[PDB]
Amino acid sequence: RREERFDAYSQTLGGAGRFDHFVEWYIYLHKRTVSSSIKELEQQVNDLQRTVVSVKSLLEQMKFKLSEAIERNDAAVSSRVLTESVQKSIVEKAICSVVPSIS
Amino acid sequence: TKQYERKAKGGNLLSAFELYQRNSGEWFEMCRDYIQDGHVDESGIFRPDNAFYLRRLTLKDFRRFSLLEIKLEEDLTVIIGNNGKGKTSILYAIAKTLSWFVANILKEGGSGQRLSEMTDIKNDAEDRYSDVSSTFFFGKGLKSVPIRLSRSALGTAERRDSEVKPAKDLADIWRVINEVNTINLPTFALYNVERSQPFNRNIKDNTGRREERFDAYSQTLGGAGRFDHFVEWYIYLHKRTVSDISSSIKELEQQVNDLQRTVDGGMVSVKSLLEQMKFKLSEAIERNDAAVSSRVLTESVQKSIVEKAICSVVPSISNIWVEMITGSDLVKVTNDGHDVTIDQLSDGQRVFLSLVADLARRMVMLNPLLENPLEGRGIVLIDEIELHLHPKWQQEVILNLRSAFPNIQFIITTHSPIVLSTIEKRCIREFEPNDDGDQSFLDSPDMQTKGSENAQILEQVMNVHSTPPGIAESHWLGNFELLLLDNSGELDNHSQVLYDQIKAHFGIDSIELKKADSLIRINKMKNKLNKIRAE
Amino acid sequence: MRELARLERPEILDQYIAGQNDWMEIDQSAVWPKLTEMQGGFCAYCECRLNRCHIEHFRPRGKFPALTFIWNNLFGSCGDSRKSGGWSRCGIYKDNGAGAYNADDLIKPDEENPDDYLLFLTTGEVVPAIGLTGRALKKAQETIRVFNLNGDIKLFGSRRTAVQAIMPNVEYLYTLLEEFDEDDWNEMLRDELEKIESDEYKTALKHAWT
Ligand SMILES: Nc1ncnc2c1ncn2[C@@H]1O[C@H](COP(=O)(O)OP(=O)(O)O)[C@@H](O)[C@H]1O
Ligand SMILES: [Zn+2]
């Protein structure tokens, strides 16, 4: 399942703060954020599909970006959320600021 | 109301049941008779007046299928096709639907199994949902029982709800009527390729759940059966057949009477023991009464039915029995004329034994009122019926199953031309070889398969050449014929070389060489005719 | 199976006498060339090409120890006890697999014509001939059962396949009867019937042609 905004309230008052959950989540965010209109993205995906062997990896990445953009577009006002790249950066800053001797 | 009364008197089962529920005698009896009435055929087989079978299935954006519609036979349907055509997907879809009947027979408002959001939705479905639509038949009173299972993809523009109320309504009739008076119940089972699994020798101690009637529904649609449950249940039946319960009651009654006399004689120390024995007696009577109350077949008869089924259907097995060896109960079999344990059976023998034994167990448990419980109703799904079977067994397997279970609707998948040679073309549903997932209807083959030669089925139905194309020698006779035709039927230097090669490779009395010889002879005769005509 | 013509008796059977001598003693390479003259390198009962082959006592040495070194009683049968086990027709099955039989109710191919008793269908079954009753039926039935002429799948297969190979040529000859004068067409059929003496399952091929 995708990460919903109100997952922030899941196990918040008991069960919060397990190392394994973090590591898994962090690696996941990293893999997604390794490497922009929907119509423009749709056009780019269509152009890349027409070209498609070496560009197949790029096509898959762009299709993923398009799906994400559509999902964000389709997603509700109540569940509005910052990009995965931004989320990652903020958490990294928090960790480095708070945890002594981790820079 | 008056309308329901009219429809019920016209033979409508749902109307009769609704009248029964609102007034809660005559309506009950009508419902019970609809379910229980039947007749014995000229062949001595019991036939229900109101049959229950799956009539139609429709798949929309399900796995590989954009749209698929299948009409099923009342008795036997065989689905054939190449690997990756979706044969297994079809059985899975049916099993999920049947899960809704099973759940609601067991428990009011029980939930069956749902379509997976991850696996069951077609990858390039524009509408981003999947539908499995099924129509069942239950006699003339209930000609159509439509069910739809639906699942929407994760992005969720709108939720598509399943429509399962008709399944629930029908299952409720079975459940409620059975509660008042025991009736025979339908068997639903799926045997997928997971039925192939190693046998654990360690037989679990009798907690006592395997004797409960509705244990017959326990993982029925899981794919493997429960052969372990069979072995436990069969040993249980053996122990009860060696030990009469009423003599134990009579003996217990005598012990209670003797202990009561001792307590009356002033020995207050044995009062605790008397109370324990009275409890044991009451429990024994209750079990006896429950057994009496269940109207269930005697354990001896149950055992005999199952043993006969196994020995009839499984060719290598002539006998099956329980031995007490050392301090443990062990099932033994006479396999190929030699006595062996189940663990010693070959994988093919064991897998097939497991299927038949499991199915027979469930039928005996669900059909206590039939003279032959294996003549009960139900729907059984079998994936890859030929799994682990030699050609000789493939020639007998369908006949044996249908003879042992005459009122089951079998929906099966196969890759075997040998199996197909024993089945009518009307029962066969074939995918086209070039199907790119947009085939609306599965259809019967053009050629009659039943009684046909294997070679013809391979070529005409399964689109496989009689000789392996990637072997050079497979082409030599064809090439030889072409050379003969090119040289006006005379055996030239090149044709002679190839002839000698055929002779050298296949041998002097080979089919191939005889065909070559035949070609030479016929072409010589044709040429002689041509010369006579020219003159 | 064929009507065999037993012609001349070999010298070695004079030397060995029943009671004193055993069949393990006698040299077999002396006996064979006279049988190979009679039988044409084909089996007595089924008519396969002999490759693994043994000398067979038509009436066996256990039940009939008097009939042991008798030229009438000997035949060249397909199969071998020595080289491999589990042969399933002809000599070997008569003893082992065919259980109880009266040897009087079997076709002896040197004495009798088999063609009056046996019929070979082009579908590859051998059946009793059309219109037999009593003993004549019982011989036909027991010959088929005891030599296992239908029940050996290897044999049933081979014979069926051999005939089905020639059935285009049979079909085609009997179309040309229309066109030709008698003596040319009778020469054509004489020729085809000449070739099949070199062939396996020659009786079954005859019934297809004639
Ligand atoms: N969700 C899906 N979307 C598209 N194609 C799928 C999906 N799930 C399975 N398939 C396809 O279905 C086929 C598997 O069907 P299956 O029933 O397992 O075949 P078989 O007829 O051998 O039993 C594969 O060719 C696969 O590409
Ligand atoms: Zn022979």
State the Cα–Cα distance between residues B340 and B317, nearest whole angstrom.
Answer: 10
Contacts of C73 (CB under 8 A, 6+ apart): C57, C58, C59, C64, C67
State the Cα–Cα distance between residues B458 and B461, nearest whole angstrom.
Answer: 6
Q: Give the three-class secondary structure for C175.
A: helix
Here the tokens at position C68 are 């042991």
Q: Which experimental approach was used here?
A: cryo-EM
Which helix H or strand E contains B136, and what residues bound it? strand B129-138
State the Cα–Cα distance between residues C39 and C3, nearest whole angstrom.
Answer: 10
State the Cα–Cα distance between residues B458 and B462, nearest whole angstrom.
Answer: 5
Residue type, B518: S
Q: Is the CB of B489 under 6 A from ligand 1?
A: no
Locate the chain B residue with the closest alpha carbon to A68: B155
Identify the residue whose tokens are 């016209």: B10
Contacts of B109 (CB under 8 A, 6+ apart): B168
- State whether C166 and B525 contact (CB < 8 Å): no
- State whether B522 and C172 contact (CB < 8 Å): yes
Ranges of H-type helices in B372-439:
391-394, 397-404, 417-420
Largest distance between two CA atoms of chain C = 67
Cα(A50) to ligand 1 centroid in Å equals 26
Closest CA to B446 of B422, B464, B430: B430
Identify the residue whose tokens are 């096509």: A59
State the Cα–Cα distance between residues B86 and B72, nearest whole angstrom.
Answer: 16
Which helix H or strand E contains B194, and what residues bound it? none
CB B502 within 8 A of CB B519: no
Query: B37: alpha, beta or left, given left = phi > 0 and alpha = psi -120 to 50?
Result: beta
Cα(B84) to ligand 1 centroid in Å equals 5
Here the tokens at position B251 are 């003996």
Long-range Cβ contacts of B391-398 (<8 Å, 24+ apart): B391/B418, B393/B315, B393/B348, B393/B352, B394/B418, B394/B419, B395/B421, B395/B422, B396/B315, B397/B352, B398/B76, B398/B422, B398/B423
CA distances to A5, B312, B511, C71 from B518, rounded to whole Å, are 81, 46, 10, 38
- State whether B521 and C49 contact (CB < 8 Å): no
- Strands in B194-327 per DSSP E: 317-325
Here the tokens at position B455 are 């070679």
Which residue among B59, B62, B64, B416 has the greatest number of ligand 1 atoms within 8 angstroms of its CB, and so is best to mutate? Answer: B64
- State whether A1 and B154 contact (CB < 8 Å): yes
Contacts of B10 (CB under 8 A, 6+ apart): none
Q: What is the DSSP string of A35-103?
A: ---HHHHHHHHHHHHHH--TTHHHHHHHHHHHHHHHHHHHS-GGG----HHHHHHHHHHHHHHHSTT--
Residue nearest to atom 5 of ligand 1 (CA): B64
CB B146 within 8 A of CB B135: yes
Angle at B398 (CA atoms; ends B391, B431), nearest 5 degrees: 85
Cα B520 to the center of its chain, rounded Å = 52
Residues of A with a Cβ under 8 Å from any B Cβ are: 1-2, 70-71, 74
- Report the first-to-last Cα separation within chain B, whole angstroms: 97
Identify the residue whose tokens are 């069956």: B112
Cα(B120) to ligand 1 centroid in Å equals 10
Which helix H or strand E contains C54, and what residues bound it? strand C53-57
Cα(B477) to ligand 2 centroid in Å equals 29
Angle at A47 (CA atoms; ends A43, A50), nearest 5 degrees: 140
Which other chains touch chain A, taking contact as 3+ CB pairs less than 8 Å apart?
A: B
- State whether B154 and A74 contact (CB < 8 Å): no
Do the bridges between strand B142-152 and strand B317-325 make them parallel or antiparallel, or are there none, so unpaired? unpaired
CA distances to A41, B93, B305, B307 from B311, rounded to whole Å, are 66, 32, 10, 6
Q: Which of B509, B525, B532 sits opposite C172 (nearest CB)?
A: B525
Here the tokens at position C51 are 């490759």
- Strands in C93-164 per DSSP E: 118-120, 126-128
CB B205 within 8 A of CB B395: no
- Residue B66 to chain A, least CA–CA distance (Å): 21
State the Cα–Cα distance between residues B405 and B45, nearest whole angstrom.
Answer: 10
Cα C120 to the center of its chain, rounded Å = 13
CB atoms within 10 A of CB B503: 15
State the Cα–Cα distance between residues C163 and C42, nearest whole angstrom.
Answer: 17
Here the tokens at position B249 are 């009651």
CB atoms within 10 A of CB B261: 11
CB atoms within 10 A of CB C165: 19
Locate the chain B residue with the closest alpha carbon to C176: B529
Identify the residue whose tokens are 């109710």: C105
Which helix H or strand E contains B187, and what residues bound it? strand B187-191
Which other chains touch chain B, taking contact as 3+ CB pairs less than 8 Å apart?
A: A, C
